[PDB]
Amino acid sequence: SAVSAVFHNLACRIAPDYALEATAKIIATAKYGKELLYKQTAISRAKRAPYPSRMPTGSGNSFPNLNEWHYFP
Amino acid sequence: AGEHIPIVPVFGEWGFVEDKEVYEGVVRLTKDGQRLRNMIMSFNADIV
């Protein structure tokens, strides 16, 4: 996904020499390549943290030693 | 001295299930909803 990102992005970086810019195609492809680069990372880093101490496991399940979820029952 | 066991146990609601002796009090599975009420009560503490 970063193959089609890098050389369009670098084209915008070397474009300033008297504060010049790159054209609309160059900024578009680099932006969409940057977006698909983080596509795999975003889903992986998205995690809902384990249930709080307040949350119970209820009496709908067996009692192992202790009850009311606290990363044990 | 006893010719029968002198300890006669009582129970609550009594019977067998799988051929496992199962006794209980009234509020056995009341304790599912008891802990759920405790969760909501303490969760709203942080909000206030």
Short mmCIF file of all heavy atoms in Angstrom, two decimals, chain A residues 52 54-61 63 67-69, chain B residues 28-32 35-36 38-39 42-43 45-46:
data_model
loop_
_atom_site.label_atom_id
_atom_site.label_comp_id
_atom_site.label_asym_id
_atom_site.label_seq_id
_atom_site.Cartn_x
_atom_site.Cartn_y
_atom_site.Cartn_z
N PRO A 52 -14.80 -3.67 33.26
CA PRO A 52 -14.36 -3.11 34.53
C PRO A 52 -14.65 -4.03 35.69
O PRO A 52 -15.31 -5.05 35.51
CB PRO A 52 -15.17 -1.80 34.66
CG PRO A 52 -16.46 -2.08 33.88
CD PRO A 52 -15.96 -2.95 32.72
N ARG A 54 -16.53 -3.29 38.22
CA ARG A 54 -17.93 -3.11 38.49
C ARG A 54 -18.80 -4.14 37.82
O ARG A 54 -19.74 -4.64 38.44
CB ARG A 54 -18.41 -1.71 38.04
CG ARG A 54 -17.71 -0.57 38.78
CD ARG A 54 -18.20 0.81 38.33
NE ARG A 54 -17.68 1.85 39.28
CZ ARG A 54 -16.51 2.54 39.10
NH1 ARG A 54 -15.70 2.31 38.03
NH2 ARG A 54 -16.16 3.48 40.03
N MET A 55 -18.49 -4.48 36.54
CA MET A 55 -19.22 -5.43 35.72
C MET A 55 -19.21 -6.80 36.37
O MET A 55 -18.14 -7.21 36.81
CB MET A 55 -18.58 -5.52 34.31
CG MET A 55 -19.21 -6.52 33.31
SD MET A 55 -20.95 -6.21 32.88
CE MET A 55 -20.88 -7.05 31.27
N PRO A 56 -20.32 -7.54 36.46
CA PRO A 56 -20.31 -8.84 37.10
C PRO A 56 -20.26 -9.91 36.06
O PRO A 56 -20.35 -9.60 34.87
CB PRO A 56 -21.66 -8.89 37.83
CG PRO A 56 -22.59 -8.06 36.95
CD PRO A 56 -21.66 -6.95 36.46
N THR A 57 -20.12 -11.18 36.50
CA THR A 57 -20.18 -12.35 35.65
C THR A 57 -21.51 -13.03 35.91
O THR A 57 -21.90 -13.94 35.18
CB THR A 57 -19.01 -13.29 35.93
OG1 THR A 57 -18.94 -14.35 34.99
CG2 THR A 57 -19.05 -13.85 37.37
N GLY A 58 -22.26 -12.58 36.95
CA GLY A 58 -23.59 -13.03 37.27
C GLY A 58 -23.60 -14.41 37.87
O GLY A 58 -22.57 -15.06 38.00
N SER A 59 -24.81 -14.87 38.26
CA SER A 59 -25.04 -16.18 38.83
C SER A 59 -25.59 -17.08 37.76
O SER A 59 -26.06 -18.18 38.05
CB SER A 59 -26.02 -16.19 40.02
OG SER A 59 -25.56 -15.35 41.06
N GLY A 60 -25.51 -16.65 36.48
CA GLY A 60 -25.82 -17.47 35.33
C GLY A 60 -24.67 -18.38 34.99
O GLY A 60 -24.77 -19.16 34.05
N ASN A 61 -23.55 -18.27 35.74
CA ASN A 61 -22.38 -19.09 35.56
C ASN A 61 -21.99 -19.58 36.92
O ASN A 61 -22.44 -19.06 37.94
CB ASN A 61 -21.18 -18.30 34.98
CG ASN A 61 -21.52 -17.85 33.56
OD1 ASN A 61 -21.80 -18.69 32.70
ND2 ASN A 61 -21.50 -16.50 33.32
N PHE A 63 -19.57 -20.58 40.22
CA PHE A 63 -18.76 -19.77 41.11
C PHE A 63 -17.44 -20.50 41.23
O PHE A 63 -17.46 -21.65 41.66
CB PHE A 63 -19.37 -19.63 42.53
CG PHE A 63 -20.70 -18.91 42.60
CD1 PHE A 63 -21.38 -18.92 43.84
CD2 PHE A 63 -21.30 -18.22 41.52
CE1 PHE A 63 -22.61 -18.28 43.99
CE2 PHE A 63 -22.53 -17.56 41.68
CZ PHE A 63 -23.19 -17.59 42.91
N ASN A 67 -16.45 -13.95 42.72
CA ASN A 67 -17.46 -13.58 41.77
C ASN A 67 -17.35 -12.11 41.59
O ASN A 67 -16.67 -11.43 42.37
CB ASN A 67 -18.91 -13.91 42.22
CG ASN A 67 -19.10 -15.43 42.20
OD1 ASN A 67 -19.29 -16.06 43.25
ND2 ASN A 67 -19.04 -16.01 40.97
N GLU A 68 -17.97 -11.62 40.49
CA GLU A 68 -18.03 -10.24 40.07
C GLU A 68 -16.73 -9.91 39.39
O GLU A 68 -15.71 -9.80 40.07
CB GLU A 68 -18.37 -9.20 41.17
CG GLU A 68 -18.75 -7.82 40.63
CD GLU A 68 -19.40 -6.99 41.74
OE1 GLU A 68 -18.81 -6.92 42.84
OE2 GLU A 68 -20.51 -6.44 41.49
N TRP A 69 -16.76 -9.71 38.05
CA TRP A 69 -15.61 -9.78 37.17
C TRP A 69 -14.57 -8.79 37.60
O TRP A 69 -14.88 -7.64 37.92
CB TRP A 69 -16.01 -9.54 35.68
CG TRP A 69 -14.89 -9.51 34.66
CD1 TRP A 69 -14.37 -8.43 34.01
CD2 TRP A 69 -14.15 -10.65 34.19
NE1 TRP A 69 -13.39 -8.82 33.13
CE2 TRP A 69 -13.23 -10.18 33.22
CE3 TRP A 69 -14.23 -12.00 34.51
CZ2 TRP A 69 -12.38 -11.06 32.56
CZ3 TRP A 69 -13.35 -12.88 33.86
CH2 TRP A 69 -12.44 -12.42 32.90
N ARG B 28 -31.02 -17.65 45.77
CA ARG B 28 -29.83 -18.23 45.18
C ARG B 28 -29.38 -17.54 43.92
O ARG B 28 -28.18 -17.37 43.69
CB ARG B 28 -30.04 -19.72 44.79
CG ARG B 28 -28.73 -20.48 44.52
CD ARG B 28 -28.94 -21.87 43.92
NE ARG B 28 -27.67 -22.64 44.05
CZ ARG B 28 -27.62 -24.01 44.00
NH1 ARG B 28 -28.74 -24.74 43.75
NH2 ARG B 28 -26.43 -24.64 44.19
N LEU B 29 -30.33 -17.25 43.02
CA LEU B 29 -30.04 -16.73 41.70
C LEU B 29 -30.61 -15.35 41.56
O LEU B 29 -30.53 -14.74 40.50
CB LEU B 29 -30.56 -17.73 40.64
CG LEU B 29 -29.88 -19.13 40.77
CD1 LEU B 29 -30.56 -20.22 39.93
CD2 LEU B 29 -28.37 -19.10 40.47
N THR B 30 -31.12 -14.80 42.70
CA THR B 30 -31.34 -13.39 42.96
C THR B 30 -30.05 -12.60 42.85
O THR B 30 -30.06 -11.42 42.51
CB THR B 30 -31.94 -13.20 44.35
OG1 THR B 30 -33.16 -13.92 44.43
CG2 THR B 30 -32.24 -11.72 44.67
N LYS B 31 -28.90 -13.28 43.11
CA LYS B 31 -27.59 -12.70 43.25
C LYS B 31 -26.99 -12.34 41.91
O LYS B 31 -25.94 -11.69 41.86
CB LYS B 31 -26.62 -13.65 43.99
CG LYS B 31 -27.02 -13.86 45.47
CD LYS B 31 -26.08 -14.79 46.25
CE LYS B 31 -26.20 -16.27 45.85
NZ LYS B 31 -25.33 -17.14 46.67
N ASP B 32 -27.64 -12.73 40.79
CA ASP B 32 -27.28 -12.32 39.45
C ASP B 32 -27.66 -10.87 39.28
O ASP B 32 -26.84 -10.04 38.89
CB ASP B 32 -28.04 -13.18 38.40
CG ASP B 32 -27.72 -12.85 36.94
OD1 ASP B 32 -28.31 -11.87 36.42
OD2 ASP B 32 -26.91 -13.59 36.32
N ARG B 35 -25.83 -8.09 41.71
CA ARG B 35 -24.55 -7.59 41.28
C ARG B 35 -24.68 -6.64 40.12
O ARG B 35 -23.86 -5.74 39.97
CB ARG B 35 -23.57 -8.72 40.92
CG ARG B 35 -23.13 -9.52 42.15
CD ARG B 35 -21.93 -10.44 41.89
NE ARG B 35 -22.33 -11.68 41.15
CZ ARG B 35 -22.65 -12.84 41.78
NH1 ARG B 35 -22.87 -12.88 43.13
NH2 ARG B 35 -22.74 -14.00 41.06
N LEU B 36 -25.73 -6.81 39.28
CA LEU B 36 -26.01 -5.92 38.18
C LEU B 36 -26.49 -4.57 38.68
O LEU B 36 -26.14 -3.54 38.10
CB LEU B 36 -27.05 -6.51 37.19
CG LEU B 36 -27.19 -5.71 35.87
CD1 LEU B 36 -25.90 -5.70 35.03
CD2 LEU B 36 -28.36 -6.23 35.03
N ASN B 38 -25.56 -3.34 41.60
CA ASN B 38 -24.37 -2.79 42.22
C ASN B 38 -23.46 -2.15 41.19
O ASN B 38 -22.76 -1.19 41.50
CB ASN B 38 -23.53 -3.86 42.97
CG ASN B 38 -24.30 -4.45 44.17
OD1 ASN B 38 -25.34 -3.94 44.59
ND2 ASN B 38 -23.74 -5.57 44.72
N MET B 39 -23.45 -2.69 39.94
CA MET B 39 -22.66 -2.17 38.85
C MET B 39 -23.15 -0.81 38.45
O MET B 39 -22.36 0.13 38.41
CB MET B 39 -22.74 -3.06 37.58
CG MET B 39 -21.95 -2.55 36.36
SD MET B 39 -22.32 -3.41 34.79
CE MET B 39 -23.95 -2.67 34.49
N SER B 42 -22.63 2.03 41.12
CA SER B 42 -21.27 2.51 41.22
C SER B 42 -20.79 3.18 39.95
O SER B 42 -19.89 4.02 40.00
CB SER B 42 -20.30 1.36 41.54
OG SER B 42 -20.64 0.78 42.79
N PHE B 43 -21.38 2.83 38.79
CA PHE B 43 -21.03 3.37 37.49
C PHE B 43 -21.48 4.81 37.40
O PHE B 43 -20.81 5.64 36.79
CB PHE B 43 -21.68 2.54 36.35
CG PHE B 43 -21.10 2.86 35.00
CD1 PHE B 43 -19.91 2.24 34.56
CD2 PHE B 43 -21.74 3.77 34.14
CE1 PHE B 43 -19.39 2.51 33.30
CE2 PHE B 43 -21.22 4.05 32.87
CZ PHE B 43 -20.04 3.42 32.45
N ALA B 45 -21.77 6.73 39.94
CA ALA B 45 -21.03 7.48 40.93
C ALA B 45 -20.00 8.37 40.29
O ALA B 45 -19.87 9.53 40.66
CB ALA B 45 -20.27 6.57 41.92
N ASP B 46 -19.27 7.82 39.29
CA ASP B 46 -18.27 8.52 38.52
C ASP B 46 -18.87 9.63 37.70
O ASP B 46 -18.24 10.67 37.52
CB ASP B 46 -17.52 7.58 37.54
CG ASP B 46 -16.66 6.54 38.26
OD1 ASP B 46 -16.55 6.59 39.51
OD2 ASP B 46 -16.10 5.67 37.55
#
